[PDB]
Amino acid sequence: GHYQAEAALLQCTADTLADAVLITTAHAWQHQGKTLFISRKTYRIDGSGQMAITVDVEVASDTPHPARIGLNCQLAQVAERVNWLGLGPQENYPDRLTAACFDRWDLPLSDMYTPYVFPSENGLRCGTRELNYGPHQWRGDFQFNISRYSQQQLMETSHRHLLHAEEGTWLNIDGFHMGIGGDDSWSPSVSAEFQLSAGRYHYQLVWCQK
Amino acid sequence: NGLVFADRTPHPALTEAKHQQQFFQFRLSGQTIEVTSEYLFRHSDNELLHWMVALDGKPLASGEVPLDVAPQGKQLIELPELPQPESAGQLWLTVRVVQPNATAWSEAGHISAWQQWRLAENLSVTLPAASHAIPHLTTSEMDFCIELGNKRWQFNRQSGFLSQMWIGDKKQLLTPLRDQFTRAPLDNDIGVSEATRIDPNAWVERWKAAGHYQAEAALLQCTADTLADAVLITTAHAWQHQGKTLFISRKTYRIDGSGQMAITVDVEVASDTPHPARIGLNCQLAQVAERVNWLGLGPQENYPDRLTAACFDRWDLPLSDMYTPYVFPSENGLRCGTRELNYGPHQWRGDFQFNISRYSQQQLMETSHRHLLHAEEGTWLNIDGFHMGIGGDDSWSPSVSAEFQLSAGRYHYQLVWCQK
Ligand code: NA
Ligand code: NA
Ligand code: NA
């Protein structure tokens, strides 16, 4: 039920602090009575404009290990360049990143999409500490991909030429992302060390305007 | 260098050896347990399999099946339909091979083999009924204090640490709750290094040279905030040696109306400092209690690279059984994969490793022989989010495998401290 599980709100509170507003949330993703995931978050918005997002996820030990643990959203902005401090310049995944180098990379948005003839998840960059897109900056220690194509359109479309740019920009920021595998392509080939099997996961992000 | 002490009392390592050298191998597929014999000549004619399913330590179902396996052969055992759990949590299957009859070498009832698997887990979604009580923050120049009934929490604003806790008029701490990144070095940490002939490559010497044992905590931040139903303390410390920042620890402490203190810890480890022996907290508790009760791996001492023999269950031992009397004293008695710990009035919950004893890490590292150790006032508690492997491939060069070194750079753990 991973693709169809719906978020159920458990808690959503706000507190005013000395120099910040704290939003605390908790969600459960359920499928036919079974709780697959729990997400607990705090968002701390301080007097300097920065929003600190803290995320703690629980994954049911008996559910198949998830493909990723992260956030996504469709940004209204369509910008020309993507600038990041992380691994690159090319697409890299946790079990395929040795060739990537850590540095300051700046590419046109189109290079952040890999035109695989059969469309899929693509264009991830790992080990990223800073991401810049238009007025937005995200900081932390994350994997990201960024394109005009939603994960939904990608999984519903069977040929790259049938893809259409969506309004704005789809951003996927992952704390964790499963390996891609490839020892073969007819049986699961992602190695145990690259499967998201730890049960509890923590990542944190700072979102601000630069 | 023995698996047993000179008087033939076992070291903890002996049980790891016993488990790994088992003559029966197990796989689980759905309801089916597959048992494989590693005997070459004998049939399993003195063996029965005991199985037990427990929910976070509470027995749900159990049974017996006689083993009937040819040498190098296999046997399939179909578990019956299990009654579904009544509450949230993780179901665990434990199997044990038992010898019903005495032999020339063993007593009737001898356990020769065991194995555990996680079964269904049902995650807790139902929020606890919101307590009516609200804690109160008392702010002064030197302290943040939180009160709730007979309970009081004191945070020193000069140091940044929980320096004291009161239940009634009784102090609960002899030493402030502080981060700890070192251990009393094991024989494997030391190797052939000596005061008169330093081995710069040994773990203990890298830790010493980097200033791990002499690092001083510098307070970066200490703030307090009142929420609707809780008090929130935020701290940040930098551990430094000779102007070099080794570790940074950022914490929040959330105390609510139920008197539960939620501690969140986030640690940065400088990439060019030798990987630390542990990432945890420690304090000297005022209480000395008779029993230690925990839900986690046990019953014996187990470390991250030596815990395959340990089983997840509910364990209850006298305090003295939580100290391993190695003739050369070192870090000892750790239990890993622990979700709940109980000692006197205290309970800690989370996902941690711990040791608990009357000896500080400082005394263990300064004392060369076990008979020279003295019980200190109260009880020393080390609770680790992370602990380095112990190694042992040899004892004269670094031998902790890369996957058991604390090299991730950033670490997160979380604990809830409450009164039982
Ligand atoms: Na597709
Ligand atoms: Na038998
Ligand atoms: Na010692």
From Swiss-Prot, chain B:
<comment type="similarity">
    <text>Belongs to the glycosyl hydrolase 2 family.</text>
</comment>
<feature type="binding site">
    <location>
        <position position="396"/>
    </location>
    <ligand>
        <name>substrate</name>
    </ligand>
</feature>
<feature type="binding site">
    <location>
        <position position="1"/>
    </location>
    <ligand>
        <name>substrate</name>
    </ligand>
</feature>
<feature type="site" description="Important for ensuring that an appropriate proportion of lactose is converted to allolactose">
    <location>
        <position position="396"/>
    </location>
</feature>
<feature type="binding site">
    <location>
        <position position="1"/>
    </location>
    <ligand>
        <name>Na(+)</name>
    </ligand>
</feature>
<comment type="subunit">
    <text>Homotetramer.</text>
</comment>
<protein>
    <recommendedName>
        <fullName>Beta-galactosidase</fullName>
    </recommendedName>
</protein>
